[PDB]
């Protein structure tokens, strides 16, 4: 991936980190069946006001080395291609070719 | 009307002083001159003082100081020793357990990462606690074992801030 | 003990260049202090020069400046020794800038004198007791102002006895102004503790530790100070904290110069235990026993 | 009894006392007066700084004696530092100026 | 009782660790429960090995996390504290738990 994309991702992450407490609270408020209608409405509107990049469902998991969006693995934080390389080199602990 | 007074005993023999005091009352049968005898206890303040509901005659004063292992009253003077108060008894009645209440049903000692375990398996030891299970009363203090910060489920009372 | 009298972080590591508990067993990083050890990392003689301090909960006046004959606080606050001790042992009250009432500044007050005054002058009125009150008196004692007054008093009188009584008071009043010694430094607020190496804890031939007398004195002052902090946490009534602060006052006064107060405390069995001033004074202090006369190598008999 | 260099006491770094404990003879107070009464000044200085108390002074002395040097680096008695710590452990502030 | 959960990727290493722990236990205390082997986690992964396209081209890796359950029935004064000193082989996550 590009540098720019990576930067964007980072920014998104930062935003998420920032706005988590508020956003979560808002969500809770919206959910809470034992609450006022007006309040709920306000909460809904409030959420809209907050930045979009603040959402965690905005950020894509990219490879930590290359930034490749596809072929990702969570345990390693790496795209398949890089993961394989790591494995070959001995750089991922415990990981070896499996047969059964 | 019987007012309260403070008695000093040899600190450590306090229950035996209280029992001997009740027995000296029922020996010298001044039963109308003594109400109670308090040694309060938390799950022990006060450390060595015995509270007595009493009146003040010189006969009852000689009685309490003739009880064995009793030094004397604590007051302004030894002629007319001092009762304590009554305005601080109303607030003490509403609350009588400030050092063991359910106000904080979780953290008994600041978690952070500085604590020592002594009432658990690894006694006389300290470690860093990352996460904690206050709800289920559990601690994940990672003690240093075999050159490694290994955690161990410890008890709040077992550890010490 | 971490962290007690013989601490690690407050003083130093028992072993030379070693964390007593476990890290640094070579000569590379002399100084690092991990959280598992709470220990400095220097020499074995480093603890002999390092001293600790005990935060005394309740103020305690020095015994060397209260009972020196003549007392330093006796001819400075223009108050008799007898009356000074009464208030100091929680047996008398002392006024301090009352206000618009019919009472002096040096004049003391008793239980009956205070009770009636309490119901009388309930507003602007100050009458404390103990070292705290004494400290205030000394603290609020314009040295310079007294000088002129005393000097003018000595030049406006002919009384022989008074002249000598006034010249001895003004001499110690102008001498305090000549130096950087404050009047509120007489009362001990931050009691200092002697280095462990200087109060050594060695075992004799066997399995027990023959402990020094100063460790008994410091351990009692710290036990009482912890009790007094806990009682001021719990808001105990007046007579409890007066006895508690009085026991702390007598404990500090017994630590500094034992036996100058009424009958000296004792551990084993009836013999009194030896305090700091008894490490200085006498035929067996430091002057006459280790500094003027020393034991000597390259010698025979 | 005779002693060149034996064990040293713990609280004040001076030699031990007695014969069973391998100790040195007490150069008492009246002997200090009797050396003030002559003009012997270096003899008294090594008699109460080098030979007795100062630990770095006496290790410098032992190296200098086994190398033939015959010279003392004086320093301070360590028991005077013990006097400073005992007076300083009161409310008294003793120092060393300059 | 002190339950001890040894976890590692190398099995030999884990075994070595376990033995060491047992040794540590057995000298100080008494009645060590024993080194009980729990099930191994074989966390598998498939990945495409081509840079671009070839889907049947694949490598199947795995990480074998081994478990060793050591238990100590009587915690004495000397025994529990000992753990701190005895250092074991690297890459072995231990997890002691009293009660
Ligand atoms: Zn260390």
Curated annotation (Swiss-Prot), chain D:
Function recorded in the entry: DNA-dependent RNA polymerase catalyzes the transcription of DNA into RNA using the four ribonucleoside triphosphates as substrates.
Family in the record: Belongs to the RNA polymerase beta chain family.
SUBUNIT field: The RNAP catalytic core consists of 2 alpha, 1 beta, 1 beta' and 1 omega subunit. When a sigma factor is associated with the core the holoenzyme is formed, which can initiate transcription.
Protein name per Swiss-Prot or TrEMBL: DNA-directed RNA polymerase subunit beta
Gene this chain is encoded by: rpoB
Included range, full protein: 1244 to 1341 of 1342
């Amino acid at each position: 991936a590009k540098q720019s994309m990576k930067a964007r991702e980072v920014k998104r992450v930062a935003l998420a980190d920032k706005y988590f407490a508020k956003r979560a609270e808002l969500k809770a408020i919206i959910s809470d069946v034992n609450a006022s209608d007006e309040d709920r409405w306000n909460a809904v509107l409030k959420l809209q006001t907050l930045p979009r990049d603040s959402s965690p469902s905005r950020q894509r998991n990219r490879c930590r080395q290359t930034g490749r969006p596809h072929g990702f693995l969570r345990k390693f934080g790496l795209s398949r291609i890089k993961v394989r390389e790591a494995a070959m080199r001995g750089e991922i602990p415990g990981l070896k070719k499996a047969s059964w | 009307k019987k007012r309260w007074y403070v008695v000093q005993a040899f600190s450590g023999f306090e229950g035996r002083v209280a029992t001997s005091l009740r027995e000296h009352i029922k020996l010298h049968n001044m039963e109308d001159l003594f109400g109670e005898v308090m040694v309060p206890t938390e799950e022990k303040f006060f450390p060595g003082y015995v509270l007595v509901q009493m009146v003040m005659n010189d006969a009852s004063w000689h009685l309490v100081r003739s009880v064995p292992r009793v030094m004397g009253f604590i007051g302004g003077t030894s002629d007319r020793p001092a009762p304590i108060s009554d305005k601080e008894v109303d607030a003490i009645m509403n609350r009588l357990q400030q050092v063991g209440d359910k106000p904080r049903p979780k953290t008994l000692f600041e978690p952070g990462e500085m604590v020592r375990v002594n009432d658990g398996p690894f006694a006389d030891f300290n470690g860093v606690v990352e996460e904690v299970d206050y709800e289920k009363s559990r601690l994940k203090v990672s003690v240093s074992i075999f050159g490694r910060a290994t955690p161990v489920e410890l008890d709040f009372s077992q550890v010490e801030k | 003990e971490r962290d007690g009298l013989f601490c690690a972080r407050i003083f130093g590591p028992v072993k030379d260049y070693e964390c007593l508990c476990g890290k640094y067993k070579r000569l590379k990083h002399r100084g690092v202090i991990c959280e598992k050890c709470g220990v400095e990392v220097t020499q074995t003689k480093v603890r002999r020069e390092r001293m600790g301090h005990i935060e005394l909960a309740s103020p305690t006046a020095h015994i060397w400046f209260l009972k020196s004959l003549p007392s330093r606080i006796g001819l400075l606050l223009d108050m008799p020794l007898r009356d000074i001790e009464r208030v100091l042992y929680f047996e008398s009250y002392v006024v301090i800038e009352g206000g618009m009432t019919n009472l002096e500044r040096q004049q003391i007050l008793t239980e009956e004198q205070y009770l009636d005054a309490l119901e009388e002058f309930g507003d602007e009125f100050d009458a404390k007791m103990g070292a705290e009150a004494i400290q205030a008196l000394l603290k609020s004692m314009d040295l310079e102002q007294e000088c002129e007054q005393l000097r003018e008093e000595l030049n406006e009188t002919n009384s022989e006895t008074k002249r000598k009584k006034l010249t001895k008071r003004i001499k110690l009043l102008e001498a305090f102004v000549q130096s950087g010694n404050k009047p509120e430094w007489m009362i001990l607020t931050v009691l200092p503790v002697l280095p462990p190496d200087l109060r050594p804890l060695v075992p004799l031939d066997g399995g027990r530790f023959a402990t020094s007398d100063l460790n008994d004195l410091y351990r009692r002052v710290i036990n009482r100070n912890n009790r007094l902090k806990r009682l001021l946490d719990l808001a105990a009534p007046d007579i409890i904290v007066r006895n508690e602060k009085r026991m702390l006052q007598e404990a500090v006064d017994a630590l500094l110069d034992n036996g100058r107060r009424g009958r000296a405390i004792t551990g084993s069995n009836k013999r009194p235990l030896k305090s700091l001033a008894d490490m200085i004074k006498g035929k067996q202090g430091r002057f006459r026993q280790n500094l003027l006369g020393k034991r000597v190598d390259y010698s025979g008999r | 009894h005779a002693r060149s260099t034996g064990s040293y006491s713990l609280v004040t770094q001076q030699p031990l006392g007695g014969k069973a404990q391998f100790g040195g003879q007490r150069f008492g107070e009246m002997e200090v007066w009797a050396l003030e009464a002559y003009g012997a000044a270096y003899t008294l200085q090594e008699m109460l700084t080098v030979k007795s108390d100062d630990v770095n002074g006496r290790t410098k002395m032992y190296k200098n004696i086994v190398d033939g040097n015959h010279q003392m680096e004086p320093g301070m008695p360590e028991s005077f530092n013990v006097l400073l710590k005992e007076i300083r452990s009161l409310g008294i502030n003793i120092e060393l100026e300059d | 009782r002190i339950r001890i959960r040894l976890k590692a990727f190398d099995h030999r290493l884990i075994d070595q660790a376990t033995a060491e722990i047992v040794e540590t236990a057995k000298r100080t205390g008494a009645q060590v429960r024993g080194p009980i082997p729990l099930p191994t986690r074989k966390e598998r992964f498939t990945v495409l090995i081509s840079p671009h396209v070839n889907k049947d081209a694949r490598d199947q890796y795995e990480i074998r996390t081994h478990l060793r359950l050591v238990d100590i029935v009587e915690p004495t004064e000397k025994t529990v504290d000992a753990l701190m000193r005895l250092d074991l082989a690297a890459g072995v996550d231990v997890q002691i738990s009293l009660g």
